[PDB]
Amino acid sequence: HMATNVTYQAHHVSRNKRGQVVGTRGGFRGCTVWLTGLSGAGKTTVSMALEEYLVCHGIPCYTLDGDNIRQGLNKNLGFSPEDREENVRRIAEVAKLFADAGLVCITSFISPYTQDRNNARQIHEGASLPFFEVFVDAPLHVCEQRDVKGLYKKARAGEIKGFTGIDSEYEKPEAPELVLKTDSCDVNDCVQQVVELLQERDIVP
Amino acid sequence: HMATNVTYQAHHVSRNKRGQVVGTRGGFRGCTVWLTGLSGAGKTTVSMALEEYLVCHGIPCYTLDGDNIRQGLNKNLGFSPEDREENVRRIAEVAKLFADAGLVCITSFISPYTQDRNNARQIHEGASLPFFEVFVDAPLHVCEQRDVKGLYKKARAGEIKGFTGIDSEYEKPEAPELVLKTDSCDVNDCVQQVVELLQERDIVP
Ligand SMILES: Nc1ncnc2c1ncn2[C@@H]1O[C@H](COP(=O)(O)OS(=O)(=O)O)[C@@H](OP(=O)(O)O)[C@H]1O
């Protein structure tokens, strides 16, 4: 349960050369926009709108969404703390791949644990890939009100164990690059705030 | 250890839209080029050359290499059959994501087990994403004689247990899309054959 006798194999294409090949707009802009927040905060809504916005603006990107990823790559993971650690760890590594390829990678995972969000950042920092932690911030009471997928109601009645914000911790970002107050903003205002961040950080022209 | 109460989250961007954004060469051509073969057969040499080639010809792509992924995403897997199953499963899912994103994903994993290669294919087929299995085929005695990484010498000494071809199985591809006889072709010739396949399949114009 640990890779041994493995040797790093260097690619034969530079990041600059990938910058040239990816998209129609010149420059390398691989990075990760790491959304984090409560269930129902608006993570998927923002991430899917952002992906649409970026593609519409000639920037190849890809959304890795916790729910979707948990139907493939991370289908063998549950919601114990251990398993959420592994879930985020695997996607942080995938996200780093997407970013290294030159895509703007957008992850919409709960990612409830500081240490694991930091671990994701550091994977990216070590690769010289910009990493933007975005706190999709709606009050839990708002999130439960929305109860989009009926999960909070199930969690309430004890029918789902370990539900984030009900029976599992959410560790509020303390140092995110951007906070999105999705209870007081609309989706397009939230997208706009992320775009403004990406323009400031030379990812969106 | 199973994802529960997860729901598919639809993207707001189509494959068509992605193909307009991804290259400077229009049309969607997301797919996976899945290499397989003995250690030392030439998988990384071909995969890195192919990646360089495709980037140099304006085709976004990314190489997922077994040694590399086993230092990040799959660092927590060894080389037991079950771990190689899980190794390959994870990367097939990741490959699917790259291909879905509109990149040519090139994997270079020993991927010694027919059934796991088949599953990788089926994951792609399930997503209407082309999948090309490329058997990087040098005879074991040739791979041993190259022994760049000194692994065969170690395996043979029993310094490395469960080494493919020595103390672990390699199930030869019986229906790959392409065979690369790397004992009798140079890398650029092996690249040209994969490019030729990709042209037949309308992945490279
Ligand atoms: N117990 C429990 N807790 C939290 N969430 C649960 C749980 N069970 C299922 N779900 C569904 O899975 C989605 C969360 O998956 P993530 O991969 O984002 O979670 S995590 O990052 O590993 O914490 C989450 O999606 P969002 O609503 O988008 O957050 C739910 O649809």
Ligand SMILES: Nc1ncnc2c1ncn2[C@@H]1O[C@H](COP(=O)(O)OS(=O)(=O)O)[C@@H](OP(=O)(O)O)[C@H]1O
């Ligand atoms: N026991 C054993 N067997 C085979 N290979 C081993 C082993 N131990 C370490 N290595 C190193 O790991 C590389 C193979 O990893 P892969 O992920 O490609 O293997 S697999 O698909 O899970 O079979 C392999 O790389 P290649 O030489 O490119 O095949 C080796 O560098």
Ligand SMILES: Nc1ncnc2c1ncn2[C@@H]1O[C@H](COP(=O)(O)OP(=O)(O)O)[C@@H](O)[C@H]1O
């Ligand atoms: N500014 C906003 N950004 C994102 N979502 C919002 C916003 N305002 C309201 N919402 C709503 O909040 C709900 C959150 O759903 P979702 O995107 O599934 O959240 P998560 O992925 O965090 O579970 C959606 O019904 C969405 O329409």
Ligand SMILES: Nc1ncnc2c1ncn2[C@@H]1O[C@H](COP(=O)(O)OP(=O)(O)O)[C@@H](O)[C@H]1O
């Ligand atoms: N088609 C080829 N012809 C001649 N030598 C090759 C070919 N492909 C690879 N090699 C050489 O064989 C060795 C092993 O190749 P590598 O790409 O690391 O194999 P794998 O990834 O399958 O273990 C390297 O020294 C490499 O230069």
Ligand SMILES: [Mg+2]
């Ligand atoms: Mg969501």
Ligand SMILES: [Mg+2]
């Ligand atoms: Mg190799």
